[PDB]
Amino acid sequence: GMDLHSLLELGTKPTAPHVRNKKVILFDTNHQVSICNQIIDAINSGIDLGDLLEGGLLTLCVEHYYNSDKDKFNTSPIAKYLRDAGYEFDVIKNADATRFLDVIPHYSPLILALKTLGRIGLFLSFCSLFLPKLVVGDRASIEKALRQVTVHQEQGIVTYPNHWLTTGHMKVIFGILRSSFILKFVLIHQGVNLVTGHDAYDSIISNSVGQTRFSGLLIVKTVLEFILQKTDSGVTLHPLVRTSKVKNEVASFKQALSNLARHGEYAPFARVLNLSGINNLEHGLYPQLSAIALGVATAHGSTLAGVNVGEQYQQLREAAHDAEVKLQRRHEHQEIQAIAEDDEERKILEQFHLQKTEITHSQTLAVLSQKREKLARLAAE
Amino acid sequence: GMDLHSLLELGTKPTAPHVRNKKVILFDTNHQVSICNQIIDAINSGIDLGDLLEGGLLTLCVEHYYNSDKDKFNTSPIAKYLRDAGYEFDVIKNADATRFLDVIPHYSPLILALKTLGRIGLFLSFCSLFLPKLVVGDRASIEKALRQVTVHQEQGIVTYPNHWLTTGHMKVIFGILRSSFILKFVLIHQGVNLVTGHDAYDSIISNSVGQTRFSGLLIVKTVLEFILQKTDSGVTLHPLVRTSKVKNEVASFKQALSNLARHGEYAPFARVLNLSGINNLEHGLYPQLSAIALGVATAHGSTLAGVNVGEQYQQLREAAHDAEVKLQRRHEHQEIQAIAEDDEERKILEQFHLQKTEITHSQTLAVLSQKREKLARLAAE
RNA sequence: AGACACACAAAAACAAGA
């Protein structure tokens, strides 16, 4: 009895092959800070380096995190992991280069644009500010960038240049970050693998990386924290999802999650970096499961009601919301009657539970009205 | 049955890697006290050393704690722990340097600023005064700095220069301390690892470090001292938090706490020094748990009612406050009826308990009114 | 022959006392 359903899955197990071969060029320049400042000046003017973009951003990376040290960079875990991923790093000794145009190897638009010609930490932290809401688009991305700038200035950590706060500048930074994989990956690796010794700039990087965890993968968090639960008897299934309708869907989700598992420590950033198997965690491929999980999560988490969802999911999400609210009131009643001893703690615990549920209800309605207002202003635009 | 929920956690276990490579330069100068006084004069004038900042503050550190001894400094536990963290220490022999500008290796603003040109213990103790309230911002930071200066003058320990008490000077010191990791870490290490032999200055350092314990980590103290308790049967769960709503949240908090455990003796200063896993102890990631723990703590500790919290937490915190007050009156009634022997001690113990609860109620209301008044003046600003 | 659908969507520093 050969397994037929494996033909539904064999397309998602590449057995770890090697395809990538990118010629990323490294620069050894005595005027390291000078060329880095030139790169920053080029970027703030909205200049697209294209092919040179990877090299320039890697130069900024090595300057800020290794102080122009190449021996340690090429043996760093970033370098080894990109060895696995298929990135080639080679060093070019342009020691006497002073102008930015000297180091660059279809160049005509770039050359014509360049005719117009710890700040590195400022630039890298500003780029990292885009990570938490990078995949949601550009509107919310720049909104959260502005919020992060305001909160960081309020904490007194960093005071950014005023000109960087212009809408065009964040648009350029969003474009350059979305189009470049190396900037993302180095930022996430530095945020994740740093243990101690953070300055202000590395602290901002680490905070942005932590906020970027599971960005664009809300389905993963919702399903794992609101449907599949580990008890003392192993993993259990949510009572609301025992139907085959979503049972097969959960089986498919488990398959996709196991496929995503092989990526490793960077699995939470799979949507940010577009890793393999990320398209198998799509909302479209799990419509009912996504709607049910999001409804249950909204029932638990008040702030989760602010998520905007497609119009084909709203009714199911609201139904799951109401159902899960009822089952949770049921479960709190069961726990109160089961675990306690006498009537006094029954009454005080149930009064507290009623107050907490009322507070969550009010907060959920407020955030739902806020989401309605946001959709209204977006439609009016 | 592979563990799926490990994909929710693999991003927070770096397996102790090495990323940092900072070129911290050490200075061997015969005019050690002279260059240190020059550094102090530069700082009091609000001069930002930037790159030279780490070297200058390390020079002050080695002067005050080792009397310009480099052999013991480079083998000190600070040096070894920074070996692990990825700091490189190299010595430069600028023996004949007299002007501050001689020892410094984008320098133009710094050079132009420098054209305008046991006090070391005074400077270091003044900096350490900022540690207890460093992460709360600048307002409360300078307020507690002023309070500490007043109390230390009253004890007769130290009499600071009057010009250092100007608002601009504490602002500069707050900026220099917040932007520099090395100053923090050396201050905390000296405060923690000192056993005896404190002079006045090291005594101030140790007192500030002790007051800095768990700064910005009030959630940790509240959860560990008001929710999870060790009985003779191991750790127990608070009756108010047996709901799954916060049960999963406590599981996540336990995960984050275990992640923070690997840091070691500097775990209480994780928020101060921005260690790894500090962003996993966020209030946002544990809204209900943070509000409940803070409410319970306020019910126990009267002075804890003065904490300012976000507007989305106030109702839940007050509900937890009232509930915990009721459960504690319940528990005192149980203990009095259970552990005692006859009626006389029942009556006197219950009268004392009633008086104590009334006193705590009055103090909590007073501090709540004080917090209201503080918020009122802050809003009026 | 084939026939559909399928980016993302929220929140997220700290807060007292000593």
Numbering used by the authors:
A (entry chain B), B (entry chain A): 1 to 105, 109 to 120, 128 to 391
Paper text:
Marburg virus (MARV) is an enveloped, non-segmented, single-stranded negative-sense RNA (ssRNA -) virus that belongs to the Filoviridae family, order Mononegavirales, and causes lethal disease in humans and non-human primates. Therefore, research aimed at investigating the MARV proteome to validate antiviral targets and to decipher the structural aspects of its mechanism of infection stands as the utmost priority. Among the seven proteins encoded by the MARV genome, the nucleoprotein (NP) exerts its fundamental role in encapsidating ssRNA into a helical ribonucleoprotein (RNP) complex, which in turn serves as scaffold for nucleocapsid formation, viral RNA transcription, and replication. We determined by cryogenic electron microscopy (cryo-EM) the MARV helical ribonucleoprotein (RNP) complex structure in single-layered conformation, which differs from the previously reported structure of a double-layered helix.
To fill this knowledge gap, in this work we report the detailed structure of MARV RNP complex in a more compact single-layer conformation, reconstituted in vitro by assembling recombinant NP onto synthetic ssRNA, imaged by cryo-EM and determined by single particle analysis (SPA) helical reconstruction. In agreement with the results from 2D classification and 3D reconstruction, atomic modeling of the MARV RNP complex structure describes a single-stranded, left-handed (h -) hollow helix with inner and outer diameters of 164 Å and 285 Å, respectively. Each helix turn is completed by ~ 25 NP subunits, and repeats with a pitch of about 70 Å. Indeed, our structure revealed that an intra-chain, non-canonical parallel coiled-coil is formed in the MARV NPcore between the helices α15 and α16, stabilizing the C-lobe in an orientation that favors both clamping of the ssRNA by helix η6 and NPcore interaction with adjacent protomers via helix α16. Interactions between NPcore protomers and ssRNA are only intra-strand ones, established in such a way that any given hexameric RNAn is wrapped by the corresponding NPn protomer, but also interacts with the adjacent ones NPn+1 and NPn −1. Overall, binding of each NPcore protomer to a 6 nt-long tract of the 18 nt ssRNA in the asymmetric minimal unit of the single-layered MARV RNP complex follows the same modality, and involves the same set of highly conserved amino acid residues, as in the double-layered structure, with any hexameric RNAn tract being clamped by the NPn η6 and α17 C-lobe helices to accommodate, twisted in a “three-bases-in, three-bases-out” conformation, into the groove beneath the NPn N-lobe. Moreover, substantiating the rationale for a sequence-independent RNA-binding fashion, most interactions are electrostatics in character and established between the ssRNA phosphate backbone and basic amino acids such as Lys142, Lys153, Arg156 and Lys230, which were previously proven by mutagenesis as important - to various extent – for both RNP complex assembly and ssRNA synthesis.
